[PDB]
Amino acid sequence: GSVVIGQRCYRSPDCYSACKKLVGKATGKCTNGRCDC
């Protein structure tokens, strides 16, 4: 959906190198210190 992953984050760009490896995902958003792709 939104897909929460293990990678932690302060800002949403922190998530790009992780989320972009998921089919159809790019940056995601940072929420509760986790990447929501």
From Swiss-Prot:
UniProt keyword Disulfide bond, yes or no: yes
Disulphide linkage map: 9-30, 15-35, 19-37
Major subcellular location class: secreted
GO molecular function (one): sodium channel regulator activity
Localization terms from the record: Secreted
GO cellular component, one term: extracellular region
Protein name: Potassium channel toxin alpha-KTx 4.2
Annotated source species: Tityus serrulatus
